[PDB]
Write a protein that binds this ligand. Sequence first.
Ligand SMILES: *[C@@H]1O[C@H](CO[C@@H]2O[C@@H](C)[C@@H](O)[C@@H](O)[C@@H]2O)[C@@H](O[C@@H]2O[C@H](CO)[C@@H](O)[C@H](O)[C@H]2NC(C)=O)[C@H](O)[C@H]1NC(C)=O
Ligand SMILES: *[C@@H]1O[C@H](CO)[C@@H](O[C@@H]2O[C@H](CO)[C@@H](O)[C@H](O)[C@H]2NC(C)=O)[C@H](O)[C@H]1NC(C)=O
Ligand SMILES: *[C@@H]1O[C@H](CO)[C@@H](O[C@@H]2O[C@H](CO)[C@@H](O)[C@H](O)[C@H]2NC(C)=O)[C@H](O)[C@H]1NC(C)=O
Ligand SMILES: *[C@@H]1O[C@H](CO)[C@@H](O[C@@H]2O[C@H](CO)[C@@H](O)[C@H](O)[C@H]2NC(C)=O)[C@H](O)[C@H]1NC(C)=O
Ligand SMILES: *[C@@H]1O[C@H](CO)[C@@H](O[C@@H]2O[C@H](CO)[C@@H](O)[C@H](O)[C@H]2NC(C)=O)[C@H](O)[C@H]1NC(C)=O
Ligand SMILES: *[C@@H]1O[C@H](CO)[C@@H](O[C@@H]2O[C@H](CO)[C@@H](O)[C@H](O)[C@H]2NC(C)=O)[C@H](O)[C@H]1NC(C)=O
Ligand SMILES: *[C@@H]1O[C@H](CO)[C@@H](O[C@@H]2O[C@H](CO)[C@@H](O)[C@H](O)[C@H]2NC(C)=O)[C@H](O)[C@H]1NC(C)=O
Ligand SMILES: *[C@@H]1O[C@H](CO)[C@@H](O)[C@H](O)[C@H]1NC(C)=O
Ligand SMILES: *[C@@H]1O[C@H](CO)[C@@H](O)[C@H](O)[C@H]1NC(C)=O
Ligand SMILES: *[C@@H]1O[C@H](CO)[C@@H](O)[C@H](O)[C@H]1NC(C)=O
Ligand SMILES: *[C@@H]1O[C@H](CO)[C@@H](O)[C@H](O)[C@H]1NC(C)=O
Ligand SMILES: *[C@@H]1O[C@H](CO)[C@@H](O)[C@H](O)[C@H]1NC(C)=O
Lengths: 119, 323, 49, 421
Amino acid sequence: SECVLGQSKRVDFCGKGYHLMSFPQSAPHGVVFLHVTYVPAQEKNFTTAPAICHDGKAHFPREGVFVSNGTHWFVTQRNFYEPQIITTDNTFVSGNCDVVIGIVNNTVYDPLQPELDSF
Amino acid sequence: VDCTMYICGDSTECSNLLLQYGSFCTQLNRALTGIAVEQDKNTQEVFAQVKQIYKTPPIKDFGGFNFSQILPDPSKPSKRSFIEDLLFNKVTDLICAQKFNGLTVLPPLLTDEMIAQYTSALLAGTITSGWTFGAGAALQIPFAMQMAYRFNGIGVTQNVLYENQKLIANQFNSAIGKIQDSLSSTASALGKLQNVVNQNAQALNTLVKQLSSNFGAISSVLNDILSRLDKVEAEVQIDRLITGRLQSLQTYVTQQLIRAAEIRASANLAATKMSECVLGQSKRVDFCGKGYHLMSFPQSAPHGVVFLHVTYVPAQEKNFTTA
Amino acid sequence: VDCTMYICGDSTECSNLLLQYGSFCTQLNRALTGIAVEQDKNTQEVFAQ
Amino acid sequence: PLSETKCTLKSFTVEKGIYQTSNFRVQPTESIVRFPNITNLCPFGEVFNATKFASVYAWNRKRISNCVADYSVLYNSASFSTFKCYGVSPTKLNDLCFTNVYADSFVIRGDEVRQIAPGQTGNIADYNYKLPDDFTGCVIAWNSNNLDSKVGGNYNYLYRLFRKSNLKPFERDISTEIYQAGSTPCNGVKGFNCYFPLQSYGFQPTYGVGYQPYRVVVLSFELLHAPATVCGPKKSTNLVKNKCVNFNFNGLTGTGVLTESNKKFLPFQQFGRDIADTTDAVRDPQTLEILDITPCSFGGVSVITPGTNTSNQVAVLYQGVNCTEVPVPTWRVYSTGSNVFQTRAGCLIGAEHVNNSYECDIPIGAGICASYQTSQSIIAYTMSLGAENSVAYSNNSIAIPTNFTISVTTEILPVSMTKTS
Ligand SMILES: *[C@@H]1O[C@H](CO[C@@H]2O[C@@H](C)[C@@H](O)[C@@H](O)[C@@H]2O)[C@@H](O[C@@H]2O[C@H](CO)[C@@H](O)[C@H](O)[C@H]2NC(C)=O)[C@H](O)[C@H]1NC(C)=O
Ligand SMILES: *[C@@H]1O[C@H](CO)[C@@H](O[C@@H]2O[C@H](CO)[C@@H](O)[C@H](O)[C@H]2NC(C)=O)[C@H](O)[C@H]1NC(C)=O
Ligand SMILES: *[C@@H]1O[C@H](CO)[C@@H](O[C@@H]2O[C@H](CO)[C@@H](O)[C@H](O)[C@H]2NC(C)=O)[C@H](O)[C@H]1NC(C)=O
Ligand SMILES: *[C@@H]1O[C@H](CO)[C@@H](O[C@@H]2O[C@H](CO)[C@@H](O)[C@H](O)[C@H]2NC(C)=O)[C@H](O)[C@H]1NC(C)=O
Ligand SMILES: *[C@@H]1O[C@H](CO)[C@@H](O[C@@H]2O[C@H](CO)[C@@H](O)[C@H](O)[C@H]2NC(C)=O)[C@H](O)[C@H]1NC(C)=O
Ligand SMILES: *[C@@H]1O[C@H](CO)[C@@H](O[C@@H]2O[C@H](CO)[C@@H](O)[C@H](O)[C@H]2NC(C)=O)[C@H](O)[C@H]1NC(C)=O
Ligand SMILES: *[C@@H]1O[C@H](CO)[C@@H](O[C@@H]2O[C@H](CO)[C@@H](O)[C@H](O)[C@H]2NC(C)=O)[C@H](O)[C@H]1NC(C)=O
Ligand SMILES: *[C@@H]1O[C@H](CO)[C@@H](O)[C@H](O)[C@H]1NC(C)=O
Ligand SMILES: *[C@@H]1O[C@H](CO)[C@@H](O)[C@H](O)[C@H]1NC(C)=O
Ligand SMILES: *[C@@H]1O[C@H](CO)[C@@H](O)[C@H](O)[C@H]1NC(C)=O
Ligand SMILES: *[C@@H]1O[C@H](CO)[C@@H](O)[C@H](O)[C@H]1NC(C)=O
Ligand SMILES: *[C@@H]1O[C@H](CO)[C@@H](O)[C@H](O)[C@H]1NC(C)=O
């Protein structure tokens, strides 16, 4: 039910790794499940921050995590390194910068501002 | 159980009569061996899930969260945590009479030092890498950031973690202190492990007590029969003892098989909670404690595992009009 | 099960022979008691959540 | 050990593993005997060979005490025409001891000797002499027509013909009270349905064997936790203590190591018992010191093997045994010092204790595993739990996977078993 007819969020229930799908095979007096899982690989170290401070506002990722290669800051999804420019679209605001332990200063790109400025 | 030594002691007269029952002693020894091999498998499937022995960093900058009561304490060679000491000094009969009557206890394959080293690795992987060491290699993440992922996982926006991080850390540290106080002082929670130990000690004690039974023979003492009667007369009395002692040992083995099935169901559940609560964050409502599950910490106990389930419990609700 | 009442009824002659089997009746009564205490626990864990 | 493995498996091939093949037991170095130091021979001739025996209603009893009895003289005498023992075997009787022996002696008819047995009923069994149903002893009887008859009949022998109740075991009733067979009382005198309760045996020498006199002795043996005072003729050995031995203390057969006891026996106590009824300590009947009885050491004999296709080399674990105990199972060729390792699982023989750790191949216990490895031989090691690793945690560093691997893992589950009737 949960691995063949479904996709399981249950960590080891359908094989080691993040469960994609499973295939049933019959066996003598038994069943064999071939569990397809995504296993993450080739990880790299990044500097990270919980929030970006911009214009005195604190920005957090809507999904994913802030990362730096050393000189620039990006937001990326947690399970695959795919850096994106930090924008007012992939982040949400809450409060000012003073409360978050380890907040870092970076610009946050607003995409509407240049669409005005280029009109 | 040395089934011949239980039923017959050192008497060859009895041993030769016990051969006439055929394979029953081999069946009994083989059932108890299968139970014993299962107990190693049960412990392996609960604790030896962690593929590398992860060590915690020497400096514990976990954002104000204080795991010192649950991380390994170097001051003892068993290398238990403090709460593991509370458990091992709190759950933990007739061993000499048992040993001399053919009954013996085999050691577990994993020592308590090895099980403490597996719980150590599970704790280290949990606090340094979140769920990622479950799915693959341990990916480091700052603890406050993975706690903010746990908050997103229970559907609370991560800024609620960061804006309250000092409060949340103080609440966690206080609740781990309450774990210490309760496990120092309770007489209730450990009943599941005590019951298992008591049941097995009671079963061995009862099996030894059954050697005092006559079963209708002229003595329960088989050396009385053989000092007092010769083969033709003695064999009738030895056969009475064989019948009742073999029925006693078969009763013991049958109830150990049933208890082993229950302990395996419990080890299957413990292994599932290790995977889904320690190596993961569970959406399953009560599976990892009452409240929305944040994370769990494994601790070893005598013949058992203790999960410390960290949960978000909502508080101080206000009434609103809604649409 | 009253193991003596089942095996022997009210006969003391039988009861005195049944003592020679030792603890078997205490084992039986204790196993059935553990089953009965488990049935209360099973109902508690399902409904008294 | 590989042969004991092949036999216990009943297979010529053996798979890789660890197998119970045997239980080891230390064998006795010698056999002790300890009876009390009594030289007085028992007066059996006085009871068996008297000129005149008692009447069975008033059956005689004599204590036999503080003496040595060679019962085999009695049993192998051709004179006794029946010699029936109960709760004891007459061959074994020459090596037992008893707190006392009661000899009961009387005369009856030849027909009635069948009644002198436990659980019997009849005129003699009910009104004259009752053995308990759980009697231990021997009943000895012989035709005495050449002694207890006379021409015109021997009226000197009487039996109780009537009683208001049958006897309790070893009850005696010499009472001369005239007995009421009638519905009315007898008023203390004879009459219609009112009889003297004793009748004499007709013992004319002419009578057939069923009515000839038989002399009877009942040797009643009180087996008690009290000290022995009657013993068979077997001679005491000297004592030996810490060596494993068979022993016989006053008829307590057993085996063990007779350690000098610390246990504080009160002066009346003769034996100590385990939680099972096995004997845990004994007082020596000559020195009256206290000895512990513990069994000579024993344990499971696990044989550790690769597959017989891989090698016929095997290591042996003496489970829970100490290496200071393993003897140089059926075979004698092990306990060679070239390969000995005291695990907490027990003494391990025939495996090299290496310093490395590896994954567990064959489990041995208490953290020990064994494997067949290079020049290949059995090695024993502490099992490795996994590669030890540092996560490189920092309060501001994250590792993010830049790639992935798709993994397929097989999980096999039993679903059914064979349906049988
Ligand atoms: C993550 O980095 C650590 C060490 O950090 C180093 O400095 C950072 C500022 C950045 O430049 C990192 O890329 C650097 O590596 C690595 O930990 C070390 O790993 C090696 C084995 O590869 C080990 O011998 C060292 O002792 C480790 N040092 C510490 C302090 O743990 C770690 O391997 C990096 N992670 C990955 C996936 O490469
Ligand atoms: C971090 O990433 C940025 C990516 O934006 C790198 O900077 C860019 O480099 C390219 C050339 O490869 C330039 O054409 C761009 O103009 C740069 N970006 C910007 C916004 O100016 C930067 O080199 C990386 N730093 C490190 C240390 O790897
Ligand atoms: C991030 O930016 C803020 C300004 O927006 C920095 O705050 C200033 O810090 C200096 C000292 O370094 C103070 O004298 C100023 O008064 C601060 N400004 C305000 C508005 O409070 C802050 O230091 C920056 N953070 C880092 C790590 O560089
Ligand atoms: C983390 O919590 C533990 C709670 O036990 C603190 O440990 C105590 O620390 C003081 C010194 O600061 C010692 O005198 C006590 O004996 C410790 N108690 C125990 C049981 O070991 C620890 O200090 C806390 N650390 C932080 C940073 O909060
Ligand atoms: C949320 O609950 C916590 C308690 O769990 C509150 O914190 C306490 O506040 C009082 C003062 O009101 C302090 O004396 C306590 O020391 C605080 N406890 C802790 C653990 O910090 C907190 O104020 C509540 N917040 C709101 C907004 O109601
Ligand atoms: C002890 O004394 C009493 C009374 O003298 C005996 O009682 C006799 O008991 C039997 C039944 O057990 C009756 O049939 C007799 O009639 C009783 N006798 C009298 C005179 O009442 C008792 O048997 C004696 N016990 C022993 C061992 O001698
Ligand atoms: C195996 O036997 C030896 C003795 O033959 C044990 O070692 C002795 O242990 C006592 C404590 O009980 C010490 O007082 C002695 O000094 C020890 N002697 C030696 C030579 O070490 C040993 O503990 C036993 N081991 C097992 C596993 O049974
Ligand atoms: C990490 O530690 C430094 C000091 O070493 C501190 O300034 C910073 O705020 C910390 N960052 C986080 C995210 O806790
Ligand atoms: C009885 O006495 C005779 C002598 O008259 C003797 O020969 C015989 O051996 C004696 N029997 C026993 C049992 O002592
Ligand atoms: C019996 O023998 C022991 C020595 O074994 C001796 O000490 C004891 O005094 C003897 N008993 C008697 C009554 O002579
Ligand atoms: C048996 O041993 C042979 C070598 O003697 C080897 O080639 C073969 O693979 C082995 N097979 C098994 C099933 O162990
Ligand atoms: C094996 O280890 C012990 C220490 O644990 C050491 O004394 C011994 O010499 C080692 N043997 C070899 C051959 O390295």
